[PDB]
Design a protein around this nucleic acid. Structure first.
Ligand SMILES: [Mg+2]
Ligand SMILES: [Mg+2]
Ligand SMILES: [Mg+2]
Ligand SMILES: [Mg+2]
Ligand SMILES: [Mg+2]
Ligand SMILES: [Mg+2]
Ligand SMILES: [Mg+2]
Ligand SMILES: [Mg+2]
Ligand SMILES: [Mg+2]
Ligand SMILES: [Mg+2]
Ligand SMILES: [Mg+2]
Ligand SMILES: [Mg+2]
Ligand SMILES: [Mg+2]
Ligand SMILES: [Mg+2]
Ligand SMILES: [Mg+2]
Ligand SMILES: [Mg+2]
Ligand SMILES: [Mg+2]
Ligand SMILES: [Mg+2]
Ligand SMILES: [Mg+2]
Ligand SMILES: [Mg+2]
Ligand SMILES: [Mg+2]
Ligand SMILES: [Zn+2]
Lengths: 116, 122, 86, 58, 72, 137, 97, 49, 99, 23, 96
RNA sequence: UAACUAAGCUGUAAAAAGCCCUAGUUAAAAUAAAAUAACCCACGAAAGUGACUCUAAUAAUCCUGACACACGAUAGCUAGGACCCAAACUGGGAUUAGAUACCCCACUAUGCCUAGCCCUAAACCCAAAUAGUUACAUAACAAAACUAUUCGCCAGAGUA
RNA sequence: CUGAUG
């Protein structure tokens, strides 16, 4: 499992200059500590799309949509261990798994090297 | 400001209010939250007799503490404030300054719905 | 109960006039809708009957509003006909 | 003003669930309803009671 | 027409003109028509700015001796 | 002659008196106008019952006490016992929507009590207890 | 060939849309003086659109702010605060005829 | 501009040093949020009394 | 020859634009005991009530001043395919050709 | 109308449930 | 009306404007036809149900020496003519 | 659950039965439900959801598609807890020729929380999904008539 | 309130 540190300096305030000179109060408010789950979802999405993909700008690609659905599937599984009776989220997870499997089948039929 | 604590403290004297506010702010800081500002809304009459801690409260001092806190330490501060015998009714909400105001466009003229029935001669 | 007494639904009489103050209070409760709410909360109505009552009352309000609007629109032509006998 | 009518009735073009189920078609008729006569009630009760108050004591 | 875009500014600023409309006269020329007649020529005089085309016609209407009531 | 129908709350400094007493010291007449009976109880401002009279205690019967004349006479029967203890003004608090609602209020005036205000305190739950089922199945 | 033909342009006489009384404002839950202007002074009932005259957003915002303050402890539920009874009347309901 | 804006607000935050003075200044600086509206749509503030 | 679009571009009804709050001189052509049928000239005739002052000065043929509110009163109702035209115009009476 | 067929199936179902209760 | 779109010039702020080129082009043919039927000794009937100009239309038909109907049109006037008008009646050769 | 006052309270077209450890006023936890807003028409795949706050969160760079997978109103079942109020059943009282019904009273399963089942509805908006058109054209009524790709069904009625 | 059948 990935371990994003709470002081990750989230991407909305990561690519801006003059961020390391500011004090620890502003850095703590702009870090992943004071953030919700969506900011960690974005950080995990970029951390996976940087290392798994070869063209992080090509979002409409099949291998990009697969790695974009993988983080949603993992967040749904993280939600499911805490909410067992959540049938709507169980349905979202069981349908996102089928959509990722359909995209994996199309990627296996189109580009086997990227599929492997 | 991220979160807002609409604190209703028991109507007490000045040093007791100051010690209750000191310990409430210190408990807010122990959880890993920085405090932005503290606004005293004044001591008014309660709209209804609030029964808290085996006490019938008719008055109460209103305070507003805004602060940046992680999403995990809100419920713990709520359990901390639920057991305090100097708080009448604690409530932590999102700050209204977080949601940007939208363009209230105004009343759009909606016409009367037509073609709801066929053109049969009655 | 927990609120202060003698504030809500309270009107003061004027010059010993009680009959008219009771009509004023009844108009208060009727314009606020408490009379029909009290008469409706005597027996429990099922949600399907409540939905049917709301839909009937909404269609009836739509019809009454449009009929009153057409009456106020055609009120002009109520004058005497100037071309009688043509 | 008149209540809204868009998206209320059950039609083919209406994608959502119907809000209103009209008993009769919402067509404006060419005649208004006749004025209903008010149900009469017994009168002089508060005066008959004070008239009988004399008899009960005398 | 293009004259309506100036008639809207005239009816937004001054409202109805002082000379009431006479629909019976076929060749009746109103104050808004005089305003757009001044505007079409101030456009030909090489001016592009709308303020320089509007307030100058509003001042040129005083040359004929008419009154303009700016609705505040 | 600026007269407001709103009650004179104690939070203000208004100078309105009835027989020398303030609005808060004037006794209360709680009138529970049910669908089959109408009960009137005149209590002091300190919540001490002074007079009590209902349509049942006046020698009426099952369906007789549900009418409006029974409540009109109940107002007189309560106003007699209230005036006997030195009560000249009262604040009437009505409870419930019944046929003897206004009849008891006018019966207190017919029995010699001056009403200064009418408070409608009817129990209206914000969807709390579920009431009984409907009749005529 | 004709010059006096009408051109397909936008409507210049387009009157601006009417705004609600709180259009481009900030409805809050701490201004019970503002929230009390839309409740009945006798029973505390929240008025509807046909009485208030607010475009669809601010009616829901006012309802949510009133329901929030009434349970947070800022505004009474059964009646209107008499301190805010002398406020300017904005609603279109008339009780005393 | 967001980080430059939050930089200025970091100076007025409440810390362990400013706690005792901020509590005392808040207890002596009462704030009110109440403001009414009119039929024309203009804000009226009760601070004029 | 003159084209219809060229005469319509310079017709006064085109110069008036919207018929809301416009000062128009209209001539009375019919008289009812209390109603005056004034012809402002556009399409229809507006019916106004005879005022209290100078009421005797309003005779058939008298020209008066009007503030036009609507050129023709038409509205739609429940289950109508077309509008319900009133065959009349809406305008108020101000004076009688002040000069 | 359709209530005739609804009542026929209603009587069928009621008699079937009573038969099951008996046997 | 839906069948008025080809006969319209446009819409001047809600009010539809009828073009006059086609108006005159139709009026020329209408006047020619009515003049030819009036030349060939044809019965012409001016029909109009409008309670403002009924007197004007009666006076115009009287000055024209043709016939007029500005009143309530009966049911079987044109179809049931040999029973509504008379035993043997000549129907109008043109209706304006 | 306590204190003052009264002998009545509840109950219906009218009564009776029931409670008088009853009724009115003043204080009161727990449970259940969530007035007005709502003349609003939003969310969710459907069922369903409108007292308040907080956390997580509402698939698909978006065609159709099962007997496969996951859900599925009320009612019902099992184990534990709660029970203000309502209420199947039941027992009394009315009405009736009869009333194991409609009306009144009391009370039980149940409706409430946790976990596991059951997988049914007039689950209907009786109108399948996806992209469209207003051409030809009214069996009747109703929600106007139709295209192109599909899937699921329909072969007289009862039996069923 | 109630009140069956041909
Ligand atoms: Mg309570
Ligand atoms: Mg939907
Ligand atoms: Mg029907
Ligand atoms: Mg009908
Ligand atoms: Mg049934
Ligand atoms: Mg059978
Ligand atoms: Mg008995
Ligand atoms: Mg609620
Ligand atoms: Mg989606
Ligand atoms: Mg599919
Ligand atoms: Mg189920
Ligand atoms: Mg169950
Ligand atoms: Mg159990
Ligand atoms: Mg039970
Ligand atoms: Mg019960
Ligand atoms: Mg029985
Ligand atoms: Mg359903
Ligand atoms: Mg079906
Ligand atoms: Mg399908
Ligand atoms: Mg037919
Ligand atoms: Mg068969
Ligand atoms: Zn608005």
């Amino acid at each position: 499992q990935d371990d994003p540190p709470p002081s990750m300096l989230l991407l909305d305030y990561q690519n801006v200059p003059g961020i390391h000179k500011v004090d620890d109060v502003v850095k703590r408010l702009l870090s992943l500590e004071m953030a919700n789950q969506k900011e960690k979802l974005k950080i995990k999405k970029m951390q996976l799309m940087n290392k798994v993909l070869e063209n992080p700008e090509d979002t409409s690609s099949l291998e990009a949509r697969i790695v974009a659905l993988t983080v949603k599937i993992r967040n749904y599984e993280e939600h499911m261990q805490k909410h067992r009776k959540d049938k709507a989220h169980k349905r979202f997870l069981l349908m996102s798994i089928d959509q990722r499997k359909k995209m994996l089948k199309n990627l296996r039929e189109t580009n086997y090297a990227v599929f492997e | 400001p991220r979160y807002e604590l609409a604190l209703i403290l028991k109507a007490m004297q000045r040093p007791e209010t100051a010690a209750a506010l000191k310990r409430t702010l210190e408990a807010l800081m122990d959880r890993g939250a920085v405090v932005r500002n503290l606004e005293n809304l004044g001591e008014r009459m309660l709209p209804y007799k609030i029964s808290a801690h085996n006490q019938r409260h008719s008055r109460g001092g209103y305070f507003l503490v805004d602060f940046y806190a992680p999403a995990t330490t809100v419920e713990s501060m709520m359990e901390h404030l639920s057991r305090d015998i100097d708080v009448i009714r604690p409530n932590i909400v999102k700050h209204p300054l977080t949601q940007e105001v939208k363009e209230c466009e105004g009343i759009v003229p909606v016409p009367l719905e037509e073609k709801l029935y066929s053109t049969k001669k009655r | 109960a927990n609120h202060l007494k003698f504030i809500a639904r309270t009107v003061m009489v004027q010059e010993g006039n009680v009959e008219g103050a009771y009509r004023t209070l009844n108009r208060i409760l009727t314009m606020d809708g408490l009379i029909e709410d009290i008469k409706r909360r005597r027996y429990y109505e099922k949600p399907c009957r409540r939905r049917q009552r709301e839909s009937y009352e909404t269609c009836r309000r739509i019809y009454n509003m449009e009929m009153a609007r057409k009456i106020n629109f055609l009120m002009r032509k109520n004058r005497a006909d100037p071309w009688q006998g043509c | 003003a008149t209540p809204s009518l868009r998206g209320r009735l059950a039609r083919l073009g209406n994608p959502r669930r119907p809000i209103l189920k009209p008993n009769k078609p919402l067509i404006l008729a060419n005649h208004v309803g006749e004025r209903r006569r008010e149900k009469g009630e017994a009168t002089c009760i508060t005066e008959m009671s004070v008239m009988m108050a004399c008899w009960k004591q005398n | 027409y293009h004259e309506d875009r100036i008639r809207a500014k005239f009816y937004s600023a001054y409202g109805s003109g002082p000379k009431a409309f006479d629909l019976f006269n076929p060749n009746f020329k109103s104050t808004c028509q005089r305003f757009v007649e001044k505007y079409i020529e101030l456009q030909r005089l090489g001016e592009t700015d709308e303020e320089k085309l509007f307030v100058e016609a509003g001042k040129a209407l005083l040359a004929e001796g008419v009154t303009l009531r700016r609705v505040g | 002659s600026s007269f407001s129908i709103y009650p004179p709350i104690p939070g203000q400094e208004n100078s309105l008196r009835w027989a020398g007493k303030k609005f808060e010291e004037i006794p209360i007449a709680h009138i529970k106008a049910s669908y089959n009976n109408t009960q009137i109880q005149v209590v002091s401002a300190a919540h001490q019952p002074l007079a009590h009279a209902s349509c049942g205690t006046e020698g009426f019967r099952n369906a007789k006490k549900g009418t409006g004349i029974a409540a009109q006479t109940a107002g007189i029967a309560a106003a007699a016992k209230a005036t006997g203890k030195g009560v000249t003004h009262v604040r009437v608090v009505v409870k419930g929507l019944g046929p003897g609602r206004l009849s008891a209020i006018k019966g207190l005036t017919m029995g010699g009590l001056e009403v200064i205000s009418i408070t409608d305190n009817t129990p209206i739950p914000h969807n709390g207890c579920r009431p009984r089922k409907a009749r005529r199945l | 060939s004709n010059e006096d033909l009408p051109v397909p342009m936008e409507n210049p006489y387009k009157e601006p849309l009417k705004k609600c009384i709180l259009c481009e404002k900030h409805v809050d839950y701490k201004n019970v003086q503002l929230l009390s202007q839309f409740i009945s002074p006798f029973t505390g009932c929240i008025y509807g659109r046909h009485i208030t005259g607010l475009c669809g957003k601010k009616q829901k915002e006012i309802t949510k702010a009133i329901k929030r303050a009434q349970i947070l402890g800022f505004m009474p539920v059964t009646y209107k605060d008499p301190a805010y009874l002398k406020d300017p009347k904005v609603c279109n309901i008339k009780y005393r005829e | 501009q967001e980080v430059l804006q939050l930089q200025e607000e970091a100076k007025t935050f409440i810390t362990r040093e400013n706690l005792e003075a901020r509590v005392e200044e808040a207890l002596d600086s009462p704030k009110s949020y109440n403001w009414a509206i009119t039929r024309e749509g203009l804000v009226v503030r009760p601070q004029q009394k | 020859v003159e084209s219809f679009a060229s005469m319509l571009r310079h017709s006064p009804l085109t110069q008036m634009g919207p018929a809301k709050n416009k000062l128009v001189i209209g001539q009375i052509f019919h008289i009812v005991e209390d109603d005056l049928y004034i012809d402002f000239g556009g399409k229809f005739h507006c019916v106004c009530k005879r005022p209290e002052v100078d009421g005797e000065k309003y005779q058939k043929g008298t020209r008066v001043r009007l503030r036009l509110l609507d050129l023709e009163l038409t509205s739609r109702f429940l289950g109508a395919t077309t509008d319900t035209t009133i065959l009349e115009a809406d305008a108020v009476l101000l004076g009688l050709q002040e000069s | 109308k359709n209530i005739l067929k609804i009542r026929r199936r209603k009587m069928n179902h009621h008699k079937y449930r009573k038969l099951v209760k008996r046997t | 009306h839906r069948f008025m779109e080809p006969y319209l010039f446009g819409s001047r702020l809600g009010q539809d404007i009828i073009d006059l080129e086609q108006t005159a082009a139709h009026l020329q043919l209408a006047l020619n036809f009515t003049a030819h039927v009036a030349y060939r000794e044809g019965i012409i009937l001016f029909v109009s149900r409008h309670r403002q100009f009924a007197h004007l239309i009666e006076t115009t038909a009287r000055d024209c020496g043709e016939y007029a109907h500005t009143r309530y049109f009966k049911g079987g006037l044109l179809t049931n003519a040999p029973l509504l008008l008379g035993p043997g009646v000549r129907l109008p050769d043109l209706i304006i």
